[PDB]
């Protein structure tokens, strides 16, 4: 049908939902208006009914509309400057002299530059080829800044297919220590190794084991980072497949895997550490079924760990309760991220300290 | 399909960096400027139409000497669905097999009867698991070197 008419009707239904007591109908109810909004928004933005529900019921109406506008709009581009080779103002000056529009990414990160436009392919600049910056995202900036690693430790990156997180951790540790970067598939591991050698990291070991196995292969790492593979409900613009390729079986199977990987990270961490016993769990989805029901499974099955403050600058605080599921009061510290509020892909970050 | 694309393009368009890398021809010219002595027939341009994908890519030494011109590069194909009898212009994802030459398959040469991976997002094909298809096989059934267009039939 006329999607222009449907989006106008979406706006009208949002207004009616917002002022139902004043602006109403003869007998049409809250459920009827919400379900009409469901069909309209599914038909317009092209979502499966199940996922469109989870998202509309997770968000307030105007916030949901802005959220889907954000999911449909692409993000501005952003790079991480490698402190291993150069620093922010020098790289910025080089690119400005070369013809690239750069600005500081913000006051929240001292290692990032936001890129607006250029007349040169940013994937071909000599400093890029030499490893002065990496094409990354702020949502992947966040997890390492949650798990700030200090010099001379043993760290475990559970899934490092792109390589940005491992390179950021190595840059923070100043090419000291040992970083085990496991990545289940070989094809992504090739690009990972290329990225590491381009950025110049000498304290990394690339593996290819099922991450649900690291307490058997080594165990006892000082710091653990787990970017759990999830549905990707926050990377909708990058991967439009998620709009309809996530069904009930997926939202049932994906959590189970996240649950087991988080248990494995808990087991592999070391409680008796002179510098850190910390685990940072991140996922690229915005669905309670996968982001916070899993942290609970950790605090309800392993009493040897405790939630600790992430120290990340901004955001809107985490969900302490949902539909019938009440969580440990401790979840509040977990901070969630969304694209409409901040032009940052919607991800979750939780931070763990082991005691036993 | 066309109204869906039109409304997406009309509304959801915001500035974002997109610049194409310099092409293989001037890259080859620069390599020649770097190397004085030109071996006889060191260049051979690929005359059959090709599909590449990424704007800029450094090819391995093995295939760094095949030149694919931009005027011959293609990126979309007219794909026909038989059961839902309709032809749609769809993007080309990748070249899977060219049953004339393995080298042609590797380089992306686009000939007759050629299996390619085509994006079937706009059709809305529902799978057995109820799922939505995003890529399928299509046999190119014409001769793009003679007809300045690519025509394929979906294998469904």
């Amino acid at each position: 049908p006329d999607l222009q008419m449907l989006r106008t009707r979406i706006t009208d239904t949002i207004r009616v939902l917002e002022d139902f007591q004043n602006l109403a109908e003869e007998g049409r109810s809250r459920a009827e208006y919400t379900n009409q909004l469901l069909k309209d928004i599914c038909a317009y933005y092209g979502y499966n009914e199940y996922l469109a529900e989870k998202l509309l019921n997770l968000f307030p109406p105007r916030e949901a509309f802005a959220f889907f506008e954000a999911n449909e709009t692409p993000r501005p581009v952003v790079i991480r400057t490698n402190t291993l080779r150069t620093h922010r103002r020098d790289l910025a000056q080089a690119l400005i002299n070369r013809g690239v529009t750069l600005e500081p990414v913000g006051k929240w990160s001292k290692v990032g530059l936001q890129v607006f436009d250029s007349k040169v392919p940013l994937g071909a600049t000599p400093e890029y080829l030499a490893g002065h910056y990496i094409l990354q995202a702020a949502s992947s900036f966040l997890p390492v800044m949650a798990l700030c690693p200090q010099e001379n430790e043993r760290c475990l990156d559970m899934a490092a297919a792109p390589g940005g997180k491992t390179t950021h951790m190595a840059a923070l540790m100043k090419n000291t220590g040992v970083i085990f970067a496991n990545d289940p598939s070989k094809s992504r591991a090739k690009g990972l190794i290329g990225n590491i050698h381009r950025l110049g990291v000498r304290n990394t070991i690339v593996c290819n084991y099922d991450a649900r196995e690291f307490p058997r292969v080594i165990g006892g790492f000082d710091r653990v980072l787990l970017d759990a593979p999830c549905s990707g409900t926050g990377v909708i613009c990058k991967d439009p497949s998620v709009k309809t390729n996530r069904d009930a079986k997926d939202f049932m199977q994906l959590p189970h895997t996240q649950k087991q990987l988080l248990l494995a990270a808990i087991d592999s961490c070391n409680h008796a550490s002179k510098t850190g016993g910390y685990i940072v769990y991140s996922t690229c989805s915005v669905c309670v079924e996968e982001n916070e029901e899993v942290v609970n499974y950790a605090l309800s099955r392993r009493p040897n760990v405790k939630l600790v403050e992430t120290g990340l600058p901004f955001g809107k605080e985490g969900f302490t309760s949902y539909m019938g599921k009440t969580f440990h009061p401790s979840l509040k510290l977990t901070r969630r991220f969304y694209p409409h509020l901040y032009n940052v892909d919607g991800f979750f970050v939780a931070k763990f300290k082991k005691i036993g | 399909i066309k109204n869906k694309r039109a409304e997406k393009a009309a509304r959801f368009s915001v500035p974002i960096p997109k610049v194409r890398g310099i092409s293989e021809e001037e890259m080859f010219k620069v390599v020649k400027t770097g190397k004085k002595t030109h071996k006889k027939g060191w260049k051979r341009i690929v005359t059959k139409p090709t599909f590449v994908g990424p704007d800029f890519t450094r090819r391995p030494v093995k295939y760094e000497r095949f030149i694919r011109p931009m005027g011959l590069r293609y990126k979309k194909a007219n794909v026909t669905h038989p059961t839902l009898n309709v032809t749609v212009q769809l993007p080309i994802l990748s070249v899977k097999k060219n049953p004339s030459n393995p080298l042609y398959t590797q380089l992306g040469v686009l000939t007759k009867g050629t299996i390619i991976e085509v994006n079937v997002s706009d059709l809305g094909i529902v799978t057995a698991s109820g799922k939505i298809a995003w890529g399928r096989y299509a046999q190119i059934t014409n001769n793009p070197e003679n007809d300045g267009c690519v025509n394929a039939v979906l294998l469904v």
Binding site: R62, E63, A66, P76, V78, T101, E103, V105, G106, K107, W108, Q114, F116, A138, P313, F314, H340, L341, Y342, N343, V344 | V14, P15, I16
Partner: peptide, 14 residues
């Protein structure tokens, strides 16, 4: 409107 004015990396140059 529904965004934090403090940290919202925009699209146009500043």
């Amino acid at each position: 409107s529904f965004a934090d004015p403090e940290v919202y990396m925009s699209y146009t140059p500043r």
